[PDB]
Amino acid sequence: RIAEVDARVVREVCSKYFYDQCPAVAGFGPIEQLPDYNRIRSGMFWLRF
């Protein structure tokens, strides 16, 4: 199964679970700098258009 993974599979698999999906964020400590969720959510995609 490992030998059957290539760039195309990784690009397709990652874009199915990572790209444009709502993430769950957990913080602890001095997290004032931690960006707002909308800033975090909008980081899932590029070119912003």
Nearest to 18 by CA among 48, 45, 37: 45
Stretch 6-45: interaction string toward another protein, x if CB under 8 A = ----------------x-------x-xx---xx--x----
Residue whose CB is less far from another protein, 22 or 47: 22
User: C-beta of 8: minimal distance to another protein in Å?
Assistant: 28
Question: Which pair of tokens denotes residue 6?
Answer: 């290539």
Helix %, strand %, coil % of the chain (to 5) = 45, 0, 55
Size, binding site for another protein by CB under 8 A: 7
